[PDB]
Design a protein around this ligand. Structure first.
Ligand SMILES: O=C(C[C@H]1NCCC[C@@H]1O)Cn1cnc2cc(Br)c(Cl)cc2c1=O
Ligand SMILES: O=C(C[C@H]1NCCC[C@@H]1O)Cn1cnc2cc(Br)c(Cl)cc2c1=O
Ligand SMILES: [Zn+2]
Ligand SMILES: [Zn+2]
Lengths: 490, 490
């Protein structure tokens, strides 16, 4: 690794993700190749989430990606600001086509006409459906492998209830899951809260979100979102049912929608990385432990060279049997020292080092990726001790970026504190009125002193300080409705 | 179900797949919605396969879907017959675009430039990679939900070895897996063999395949394919490595590729269906057993109506604990008799019927979907007996369509037998020379008497009869190289 996090972050990231065999650039910019080392992290997230939404009664499915012109345009889901970012299909070979078709940037326009058809009785509710798919949005903005890409993978859930007490409960349930993905797997602490009326999903009553901080840049980033849509789309798409014991009457259904994307892997990179390379949390690594045989020489007995290469498999065998994801790298051509480095770039949590010097002592050595600390372990304790080190790494990585968050997230009550602490490369809870103006304003004000300015992130469900009796927005005109998280974003 | 399999098959299928809540048509023909009842079958296939290729050392990944014009066209992967079936992206919103981009119809053109880059040393081999993704091919041919669709889901593996003994072994390993999917899960017997030089994947040395018979129509269908590519693509894309102990020399890598698609679900439907509806093999059903409470009346004691609805959960609880996938349908608004029918269309293998008459006798009743046979079972035997019935159904469905295959697959040595037995709505092993002509010919000959004519299916690895000393192609000119499976196809 030539570049350094503190110094040229933009380069560091692009070097870490290539040299860890995670990403590979494609002959079309904005598009990237998810190599196995990264995909296994996505698949790890996928396994957890999938397991939890199904406990909630959600079922997976697959809708088409092609949304016809008379669909987006036929309605006004959009919110048509994004309309110049949709790609279009126009010709089948050379032969032109009847109407052009769009590539899904999201799936409301494809799914909701159908929801309308399936909801006949009130009996056909709820309808909770999820899909794991790719989506395509267009961007000329200088692209970036996990955070700013043209095609990406995600998950999008769309549920639809009779009542609102229902819909409401799910929205918060899902956001907790999205938290668990970041806090329990990825070991990334996040801030839960509600979008401002400026920022919330348009065409949807409210919008809960999960925001994480990437100190390295002093910006914060959006993790995943969970929206309550109320009746907006049902009205739009006539998803209606005859009421319960309010006969002859027409009730609109209450809807939700929530998504999480592959930016997770980018955030995970940005947060836990070294100048030594990528670092993975034990919960998501393809390989929790790598077993490398070291201490091999040109004239090492040939019957010894197969005691080593066999001792290694005993660890491999024993660890696999306690569901530790272990590879033994028994490759003849690379050095040991080469391997040490290779698996360090990739960020494998523990390196299990096996030398004959240690074999003699019926023992072995384990190296933590995060701290670098070596430990010498008895062969009869490989399971308990290594499982423990895996748990202790997860904690460390989490109880680091969280202390790193607490330093970098503070309250400021004047506007003059807020421009100092923001330029201090941090993020701030301020008193805020809520009006779009004293936000729409705030951006321009902060941008004049900073190459851009503070955005609202979320309105913390649990803000740092409680608000005091008379208290005013940073503007100085209106009173403060709620402490509100602001910062420069991604 | 109004239509009937024997009578209007084209309608039967379209009714079965809608009324079993599997498929839902979209505002663009050729495109369909995979509802949960179907997707869970795809996901079941996915779970099995994924588990097996990983034992083989394959790793999953995700390449982009956008293949640039200077890629397909830059090379000649194609085999350009299919070129007028590729969709194209041309505008980002209204703004036109630099060059147009294609939607992946397959991924050789996207993956192989990269394979070239990753294979530097000979050390970087093998490279076995898989991806589960959607692909888009265009068709005006009257579409059909699982068998003839424009967008579909599949899996595509692309491996790349130094030697050919390697590549060769995998091709056959994979085809056995594809067999297992059809024979062990889907309970559909298939015929293993090699494509003819007419039919094989172009741009690839040979092509093993799996062919299944859909009696209902007298046609056969392609299950999945596994190709050996040898050196064609490496040469094309310069995937090269310095040789082992043949220094200073340039070796091309040997490649494979293999795919399986969502047509599986269509074949599964076509093969096992009733006029009573879809039928699922226990190995893939979202719901192996449905628990329905029956024998409820208007004036049934309220404390009895909760002994029933509780007895049901005891079965639910006990079955879930032996990994039987069970739903208890406790819905208050539908009749019992309505439920019986609903879950019959969906093809749930067993209906677990709970009535108080049986509760009195501390017992219950189970109905097989395939045969219709009812059985009365002790409450202390619910696990062993139901698991057994699930196993016995799988077998039945398999040892049915297999006897149905043996009737409908026969040998014919003259050409005059072959035109009779083919028009008998069956498929035939004939003596065949191999020349494209005496195949290219065979189609036109059979088409003049039949609304189209026999195609080669495969060249059985284990043909019905052995060939006799002097023996000639059905044409009568050349000698027969091998018994070869022919028939009308899909
Ligand atoms: O992504 C969304 C809408 C919903 N999609 C499913 C997950 C929950 C989420 O609120 C917001 N969004 C974001 N970007 C977009 C870009 C384009 Br282009 C279009 Cl057409 C539409 C959108 C767009 O609708
Ligand atoms: O699907 C293939 C090529 C390979 N894809 C991966 C699985 C193994 C398989 O042999 C054959 N095929 C089939 N249909 C096609 C349609 C179009 Br359009 C194009 Cl460009 C290309 C193709 C095309 O290459
Ligand atoms: Zn204000
Ligand atoms: Zn011939």
């Amino acid at each position: 690794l030539e570049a350094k996090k503190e110094e040229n972050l933009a380069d560091w990231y692009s070097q870490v993700i290539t040299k860890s065999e995670m990403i590979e650039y494609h002959d079309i910019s904005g598009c990237y190749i998810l190599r196995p080392w990264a995909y296994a992290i996505w698949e790890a997230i996928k396994d957890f989430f999938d397991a939890e939404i199904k406990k909630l009664g959600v079922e997976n499915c697959y809708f088409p990606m092609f949304v016809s012109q008379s669909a987006l345009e036929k309605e006004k889901t959009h919110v048509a600001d994004f309309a110049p970012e949709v790609a279009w299909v126009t010709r089948s070979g050379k032969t032109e086509l009847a109407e052009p078709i769009a590539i899904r940037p999201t799936s409301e326009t494809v799914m909701y006409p159908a929801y309308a058809k399936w909801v006949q009785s009130h009996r056909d509710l709820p309808i909770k459906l999820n899909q794991w798919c790719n989506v395509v949005r267009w961007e000329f903005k200088h692209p970036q492998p996990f955070l700013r890409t043209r095609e990406f993978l995600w998950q999008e859930g769309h549920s639809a209830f009779a009542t609102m007490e229902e819909a409401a409960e799910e929205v918060l349930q899902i956001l907790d899951l999205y938290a668990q993905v970041y806090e329990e797997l990825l070991a990334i602490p996040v801030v839960k809260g509600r979008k401002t009326e400026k920022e919330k999903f348009a065409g949807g009553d409210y919008t809960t979100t999960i925001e994480a901080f990437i100190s390295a840049s002093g910006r914060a980033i959006q993790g995943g979102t969970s929206h309550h849509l109320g009746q907006n789309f049902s009205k739009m798409f006539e998803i209606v049912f005859e009421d319960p014991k309010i006969p002859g009457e027409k009730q609109f259904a209450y809807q939700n929608s929530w998504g999480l994307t592959t930016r997770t892997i980018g955030v995970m990179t940005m947060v836990h990385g070294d100048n030594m390379g990528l670092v993975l949390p034990p919960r998501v690594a393809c390989v929790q432990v790598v077993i490398i045989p070291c201490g091999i020489t040109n004239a090492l007995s040939e019957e010894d060279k197969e005691a080593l290469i066999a001792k290694c498999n005993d660890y491999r065998r024993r660890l696999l049997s306690v569901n530790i994801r272990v590879r033994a790298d028994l490759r003849d051509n690379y050095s040991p020292g080469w391997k040490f480095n290779h698996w360090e770039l990739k960020g494998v949590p523990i390196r299990l080092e096996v030398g004959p010097r240690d074999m003699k002592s019926c023992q072995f050595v384990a190296v933590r990726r995060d701290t670098g600390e070596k430990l010498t372990v008895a062969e009869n304790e490989a399971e308990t001790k290594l499982q423990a080190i895996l748990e202790d790494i997860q904690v460390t990585l989490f109880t680091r970026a969280s202390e790193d968050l607490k330093t970098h997230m503070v309250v400021a009550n004047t506007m003059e504190d807020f421009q100092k602490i923001l330029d201090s490369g941090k993020i701030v809870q301020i008193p805020f009125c809520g009006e779009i103006d004293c936000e729409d304003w705030i951006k321009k004000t902060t941008a004049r002193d900073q190459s851009m300015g503070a955005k609202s992130l979320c309105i913390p469900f649990k803000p740092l300080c409680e608000l005091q009796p008379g208290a005013k927005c940073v503007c100085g005109k209106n009173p403060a409705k709620y402490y509100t998280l602001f910062g420069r974003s991604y």
